[PDB]
């Protein structure tokens, strides 16, 4: 994938047209975009208008993800408090969804040095599954535990 200078300048011109279209009508939610500006730039910093707009879009998405995770946690707590000693069976699905939301919210913008957030021990469980498969097929002895059906309340 290679970008010639002509294509780069053409995309620059088109982004200027986008900025002019946005400027025409006032919008109080200008910095809370619902859609990104699609691009194939090597670095988004090359075009400043795309950079800031998509950064605002990412911020909006992350705020939505945080509030969604709080919602999922609320229904998980309610479902836990309702069933009683049947919680482990009946709250498996809601916990699954809540942990999925947590991983989405954390992992999308973890950062340059941050590690992936293993809510529910899914990646470890997958690693153990792969290790056990390889050890059994190759005749080796695995020094690690086999994969578990359930390691947390959901995942």
């Amino acid at each position: 994938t290679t970008a010639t200078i002509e294509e780069r300048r053409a995309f620059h011109k088109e982004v200027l047209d986008i900025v002019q279209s946005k400027l025409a009508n006032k919008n109080s939610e200008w910095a809370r975009p619902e859609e990104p500006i699609l691009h194939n730039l090597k670095s988004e910093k090359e075009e400043p208008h795309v950079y800031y707009h998509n950064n605002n879009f990412r911020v909006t998405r992350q705020l939505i993800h945080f509030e969604k995770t709080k919602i999922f946690e609320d229904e998980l707590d309610k479902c836990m408090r309702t069933h009683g000693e049947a919680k482990y069976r009946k709250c498996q699905e809601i916990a699954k969804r809540f942990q999925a939301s947590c991983r989405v919210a954390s992992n999308l913008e973890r950062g340059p040095n941050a590690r992936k957030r293993d809510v529910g021990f899914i990646y470890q469980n997958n690693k153990l599954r792969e290790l056990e498969k390889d050890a059994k097929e190759l005749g080796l002895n695995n020094p690690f535990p086999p994969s578990s059906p359930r390691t947390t309340i959901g995942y």
């Binding site: 910095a31 809370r32 950079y51 950064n55 913008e109 973890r110 950062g111 040095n113 941050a114 957030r117």
Partner: protein, 438 residues
Amino acid sequence: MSLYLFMLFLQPLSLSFVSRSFSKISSLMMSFATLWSAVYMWFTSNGANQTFYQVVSWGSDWSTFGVCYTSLYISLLCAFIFPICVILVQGYRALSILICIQTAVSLSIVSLHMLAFYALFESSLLLFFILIGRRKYGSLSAAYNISIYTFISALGFLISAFWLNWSFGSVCALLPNEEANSFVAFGIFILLWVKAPLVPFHLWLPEAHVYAPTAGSVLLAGVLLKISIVGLHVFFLPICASSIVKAFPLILSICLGSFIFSSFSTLKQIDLKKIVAYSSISHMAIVFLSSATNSGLGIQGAVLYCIAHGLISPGLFLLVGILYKNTNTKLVFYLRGLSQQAPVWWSVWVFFMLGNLAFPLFPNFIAEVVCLSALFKNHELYAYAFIFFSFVGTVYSSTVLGRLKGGVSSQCVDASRLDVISWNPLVLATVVTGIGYM
């Protein structure tokens, strides 16, 4: 924004025209009016404008001023703590020096131009050289230390700013630029390394705090240490992220070493102001490392913990200054029986010392939890290292409290009405932030 900048320029302006007998009253009114203008700036700052709440330019790239999350918190903190400094300080000379220092520092926080940031921040170089080296109660050695350290670090930062202005053509933050050069990254980094006291460039801060006046110490601890994080979020992380991720093991080495050795050096202190000053150095490392992770948690946690420090350490410095006025001593060994002799001072001292030990009902707890969570997001061992060696702070804080608490004393040294008026706002702010209104 414009009102805040105008009031910041108005405060030094008023001193030239005041009667020289109305100076204290006019300065206090001006400080409160600047606080109100900062509240207005917060009111006119809409969260819908996610990148920058407000940007104003007055005809040039240098005159570009703007507020973001970090800038707004730090500016409100300085505007909050300045009036206490104003009442603590007497004399037209001292008022002039402190007003000029505050104007320069508060203009630095909202600046969006690295060169203008450098110009405003270092304008307060001689003012501290004169302030810390004042006639009877100042030391020339400490003033030399602080001035030379600041000059070398700021000159390195200036060289990096010149290279950026030559290459990109601009040095304003609002224009997106990225660099992978390590020389420029170090040039920007060295200022942060020195200004945020980080071992082994932390030697200037202690000597400065001990030999600075109480208002000077309050400003130094409250906001001048926080200027490092404004520079990091505004002028280093946007452009120098590749270098911070390349050097992260080294960054952790230096930060955790600063934490540990500053904690151990605190144990060898006999002077109360030195104890508080070394506690500040140990506290800065968590902030620096949490920001350096370049994650959403780290930046927020660092700015929060800066606010917590800028509400707790000024209170300790103010209480120590009050005690020194009452007793003419700062040696812990001379001071005994303070619990019986000064119950009202002792209550606030214990409250603020608990705040410095990061107990739950204090803002330091919430801030530390967020910062440790960011460190745990990077790695478990990173958080574990900081959590364990926090016990060293407990040892020296407990030893100091035990030494002061009991004994035989023949002097009633308790605070007056003026002193209680001085710390009431800090106590109220500490409580309000502690219950979660961070």
